[PDB]
C-alpha cells in the first residue's frame, strides 16, 4: 500500500518495542539513583545502551519512509521525530572525535579544581568549594579570586576543545539541512503545515528580541536599584553609572541575583514568610507533604497520584548503608508507572519543591494516552513552566492560611510584599537578560559572526551592553568564559530558560483570570479552581501532540509568547523602583571598568 500505510505499521511495531526497552532503561536508572550499588550501576548502562542502540537501528530504519509523501499530521509528526538522524551523518572518525570532545569537557567541568596560591594544600572544586565563596563571601578580593581562578584554569583548558567542538557540531548541523548548529536548536520551536499555528527557526530570534525589549525598563531599574545597594556593600569599587562587576552578582556567573537578597533587601525588618518551623511544630512528615500536594491538584479537577506512585516512589533519604543522589526528580518510566525521588526534609522549600515536582508528574499522566513518541511537553520549555506555576500558587499566604500552616491572624501589609517581589525579581528577572545574551553569543558563534580571535572581545562587548556587567580582570582568547558554565561546556540549549519564564506567567495570568482572582496577579492561588484547572489539562493532555502554539492557545488565549503577563506580576515592584531610582542613575556606560586599566 502507500508509503503511509507501511509507515503506520512501522511506527506501531516501534511503539510496542520501544515501550519495553525504554521501561527497562528507565527502571534501571531508578534502581541506581536510589541504591548506588556496583552491580546496579552496570545494567543501568546495559539497558540504556540497548535502548540507545534500538533508536539508532530504528531511526536509520525509518529513513526508508520519505516523510514528504505522507498526510495524517500525527504520522508525519511521529516519523519526523523518529528520524533522529543526528550525529551519525558524520564519518565514524569525526563522531569518535566529537564524542571525545564532548565527553572531556563534561569531565573537566566537574573534576576541575583550583588551589589557594596562599595555601598549597587547600584546593576546591566548583561544587561545593567555590560555589560557597561565590554565593556567601563579602570579600571583594576573595570573590575576584574564585571568579578568575575558575575562568583561568578550566576556562582556558576548554578553549581548544570548544573551538573544535564548534566546527564539528556545525558540520553535523549543516548536513541535516540547517544553516548552522545554532539554527539547529531554534528547531525545537518549529511548526509546519497548519495555518497560523506555524512558526519558523528564524522567527524565534525575532520574537525573543521583540519581547526582550519590553523587559529592559524593568531590568534597567532593578539593575539601577541593586547597583546602589552594592555600592554600600563594596564601597569604592563600583561606579554609580558603570556596569556591575561579574564576581559580585551572587553566584559563579551571576546567572541568578538570588543570593544578593542578603544585601539588597528593601525592608530588612519584615521577616518570615517561612513555615519551616510551623510544619515541624505540627509534626508534619514526608507523607503529609506529598499527600497535601496531591490534595492541591485534586482541588482543581485532577487525579489522585496512582497507587503505583505511593508504593513505588522514594520520599525520604534512606540514611547511610544504602546511598542515593538526592536531586528532586519527576519520573515517568512509562507503562503507567510514575514516581518521584525526593530526599524530603520538613521545610517550606521542600513543601514548595514537591508541589513543583508533582506538577510534571501531573503533566506526565495527562499526555500518556498520546502515541509513545508524542508523550512529552509541547516544547523544550513547556514542562518547566507548568512545574513552576504550582510553586507560585502554593507560596501565597492565601494557600498557607487555607492549609493551617500560617497562623490565621497574619496581615498582608504592603512592605512584606515589596520584599517578596524583589526576592522574586533577583532570580526571575535577574537571569532573563543574562540568559538572552548567553544564547545570543552562542547563536552568533554558530552563525559564524564571531571570529575565533574575538571570542571574548565579543563576549564582554555584549555582557556590557545587554546585561550591564563587566569583567574584573581583562580576558583575551586564552580564556573561554561562556563555557565555564555547565550548560555551555556540557552541550545545552539555554534559551529554554528564557521562554519558559515568559510562558509560566502567561499561564498563571489566564488561570487566575479563569479562577476569578481579586488582587494583584501575584496574590493568586488557583486552588479549588476547578474550571481554571480544566483549561490547563486541555493543553497538558496534548504533550508534543499539537503544534506548541495551539498547545498554548488552549491556556492563555493566543498563539504567541507574550511578555506583558510577566510585567504585570511585577507592577507593584516596577513602580516602587522607578521611585527608588529617583536620585540613583538608571542604565549604564559600557566604557567603564573595574580594573579600568
Amino acid at each position: 500500500s502507500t508509503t503511509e500505510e507501511l509507515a503506520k505499521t512501522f511506527l506501531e511495531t516501534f511503539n510496542y518495542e520501544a515501550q519495553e526497552l525504554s521501561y527497562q532503561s528507565s527502571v534501571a536508572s531508578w534502581n541506581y539513583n536510589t541504591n548506588i550499588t556496583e552491580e546496579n550501576v552496570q545494567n543501568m548502562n546495559n539497558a540504556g545502551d540497548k535502548w540507545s542502540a534500538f533508536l539508532k537501528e530504528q531511526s536509520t530504519l525509518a529513513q526508508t519512509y520519505p516523510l514528504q509523501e505522507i498526510q495524517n499530521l500525527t504520522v508525519k509528526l511521529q516519523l519526523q521525530a523518529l528520524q533522529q538522524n543526528g550525529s551519525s551523518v558524520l564519518s565514524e572518525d569525526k563522531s569518535k572525535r566529537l564524542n571525545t570532545i564532548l565527553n572531556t569537557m563534561s569531565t573537566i567541568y566537574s573534576t576541575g579544581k583550583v588551589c589557594n596560591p596562599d595555601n598549597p594544600q587547600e584546593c576546591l572544586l566548583l561544587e561545593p568549594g567555590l560555589n560557597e565563596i561565590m554565593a556567601n563571601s563579602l570579600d571583594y578580593n576573595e570573590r575576584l579570586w574564585a571568579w578568575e581562578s575558575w575562568r583561568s584554569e578550566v576556562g582556558k583548558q576548554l578553549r581548544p576543545l570548544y573551538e573544535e567542538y564548534v566546527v564539528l557540531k556545525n558540520e553535523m548541523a549543516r548536513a541535516n539541512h540547517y544553516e548552522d548548529y545554532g539554527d539547529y536548536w531554534r528547531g525545537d520551536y518549529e511548526v509546519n503545515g497548519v495555518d497560523g499555528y506555524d512558526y519558523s527557526r528564524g522567527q524565534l530570534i525575532e520574537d525573543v528580541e521583540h519581547t526582550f525589549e519590553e523587559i529592559k525598563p524593568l531590568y534597567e531599574h532593578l539593575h539601577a536599584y541593586v547597583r546602589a545597594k552594592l555600592m554600600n556593600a563594596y564601597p569604592s569599587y563600583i561606579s554609580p553609572i558603570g556596569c556591575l562587576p561579574a564576581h559580585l552578582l551572587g553566584d559563579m556567573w551571576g546567572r541568578f541575583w538570588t543570593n544578593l537578597y542578603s544585601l539588597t533587601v528593601p525592608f530588612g525588618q519584615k521577616p518570615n514568610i517561612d513555615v519551616t518551623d510551623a510544619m515541624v511544630d505540627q509534626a508534619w512528615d514526608a507523607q503529609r507533604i506529598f499527600k497535601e500536594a496531591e490534595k492541591f491538584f485534586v482541588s482543581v479537577g485532577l487525579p489522585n497520584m496512582t497507587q503505583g506512585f505511593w508504593e513505588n516512589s522514594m520520599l525520604t533519604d534512606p540514611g547511610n548503608v544504602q546511598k542515593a543522589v538526592c536531586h528532586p526528580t519527576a519520573w515517568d518510566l512509562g507503562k503507567g508507572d510514575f514516581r518521584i525521588l525526593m530526599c524530603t526534609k520538613v521545610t517550606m522549600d521542600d513543601f514548595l519543591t514537591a508541589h513543583h515536582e508533582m506538577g510534571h508528574i501531573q503533566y506526565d499522566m495527562a499526555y500518556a494516552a498520546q502515541p509513545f513518541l508524542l508523550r512529552n511537553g509541547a516544547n523544550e520549555g513547556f514542562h518547566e513552566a507548568v512545574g513552576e506555576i504550582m510553586s507560585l500558587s502554593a507560596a501565597t499566604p492565601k494557600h498557607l492560611k487555607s492549609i493551617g500552616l500560617l497562623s490565621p491572624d497574619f496581615q498582608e501589609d504592603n512592605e512584606t510584599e515589596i520584599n517578596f517581589l524583589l526576592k522574586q525579581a533577583l532570580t526571575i528577572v535577574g537571569t532573563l537578560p543574562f540568559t538572552y545574551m548567553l544564547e545570543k553569543w552562542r547563536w552568533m558563534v554558530f552563525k559564524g559572526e564571531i571570529p575565533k580571535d574575538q571570542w571574548m572581545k565579543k563576549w564582554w562587548e555584549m555582557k556590557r551592553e545587554i546585561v550591564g556587567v563587566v569583567e574584573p580582570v581583562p580576558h583575551d582568547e586564552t580564556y573561554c568564559d561562556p563555557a565555564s558554565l555547565f550548560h555551555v561546556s556540557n552541550d545545552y540549549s539555554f534559551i529554554r530558560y528564557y521562554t519558559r519564564t515568559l510562558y509560566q506567567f502567561q499561564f498563571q495570568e489566564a488561570l487566575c483570570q479563569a479562577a476569578k482572582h481579586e488582587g494583584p496577579l501575584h496574590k493568586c492561588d488557583i486552588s479549588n479552581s476547578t474550571e481554571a484547572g480544566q483549561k490547563l489539562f486541555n493543553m497538558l493532555r496534548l504533550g508534543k501532540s499539537e503544534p506548541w502554539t495551539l498547545a498554548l492557545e488552549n491556556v492563555v488565549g493566543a498563539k504567541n509568547m507574550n511578555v506583558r503577563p510577566l510585567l504585570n506580576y511585577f507592577e507593584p515592584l516596577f513602580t516602587w523602583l522607578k521611585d527608588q531610582n529617583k536620585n540613583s542613575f538608571v542604565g549604564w556606560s559600557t566604557d567603564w571598568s573595574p580594573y579600568a586599566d
Binding site: 500500500s1 500505510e5 507501511l6 505499521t9 512501522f10 506501531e12 511495531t13 510496542y16 519495553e20 521501561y23 527497562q24 527502571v27 530504519l61 526508508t64 496512582t306 497507587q307 503505583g308 513505588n312 518510566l333 507503562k335 503507567g336 508507572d337 510514575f338
Partner: protein, 173 residues
C-alpha cells in the same frame, strides 16, 4: 466443575485462548456472585439462577479488559478475541499481578497486533507467519516483515493499566 477454570494454575495467551464446554453440571453461581476477588463482572445478559455453557479464559493487560464486550474497536477485539454484538452472558477479571508478573519482567504472555482482516465472534487464530501488509510471503529481516505475535512483559511495578489480569468469558446457549 468451575474450580477447574478459575482457581486454575496456568492461563493462556489471548491469541490462543481456551474454551471449556461445561454441560450436565450443576453449580449455584454463588461461587462467583459474592467475592471482592473480582474487579470486573459486566454481565451483558442477566444475573439470576435456574441451575443448568461455554467458559473461555485468558490474560490481557489492564486497560485491555474494556475490550471484552460487544462493540469495542480492537487490537485485542480485532485480533485475538471478539464477542458478538448480541448473544451474550458474562465477563470476569482480577488483578493477577502477584501471580503473572515479576519485578524483573514476565514476557510469557502474548497477543496479536497485526492481521489482514478482523475476527468473527468467537473465532481464533493460532497462526504465526511473517506478515507483510499485502499478502506476499514475508521473510524477516526483509523490510516490512513483522512477526504478528508480541510479548506483554508484565512487571509488578507498572501502572494498573499495564498489570496482568486473567479473564473468563462465560457464554450461555
Amino acid at each position: 466443575p468451575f474450580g477447574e477454570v478459575f482457581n486454575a494454575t496456568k492461563f493462556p495467551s489471548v491469541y490462543a485462548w481456551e474454551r471449556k464446554k461445561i454441560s450436565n453440571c450443576v453449580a449455584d453461581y454463588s461461587v462467583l456472585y459474592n467475592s471482592t476477588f473480582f474487579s470486573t463482572f459486566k454481565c451483558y445478559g442477566v444475573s439470576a439462577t435456574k441451575l443448568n455453557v461455554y467458559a473461555d479464559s485468558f490474560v490481557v493487560k489492564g486497560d485491555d479488559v474494556r475490550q471484552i464486550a460487544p462493540g469495542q474497536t480492537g487490537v485485542i477485539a480485532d485480533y485475538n478475541y471478539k464477542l458478538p454484538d448480541d448473544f451474550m452472558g458474562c465477563v470476569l477479571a482480577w488483578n493477577t499481578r502477584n501471580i503473572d508478573a515479576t519485578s524483573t519482567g514476565n514476557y510469557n504472555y502474548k497477543y496479536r497486533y497485526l492481521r489482514h482482516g478482523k475476527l468473527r465472534p468467537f473465532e481464533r487464530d493460532i497462526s504465526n507467519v511473517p506478515f507483510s501488509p499485502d499478502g506476499k510471503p514475508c521473510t524477516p529481516p526483509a523490510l516490512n516483515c513483522y512477526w504478528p505475535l508480541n510479548d506483554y512483559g508484565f512487571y509488578t511495578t507498572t501502572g494498573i493499566g499495564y498489570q496482568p489480569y486473567r479473564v473468563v468469558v462465560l457464554s450461555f446457549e
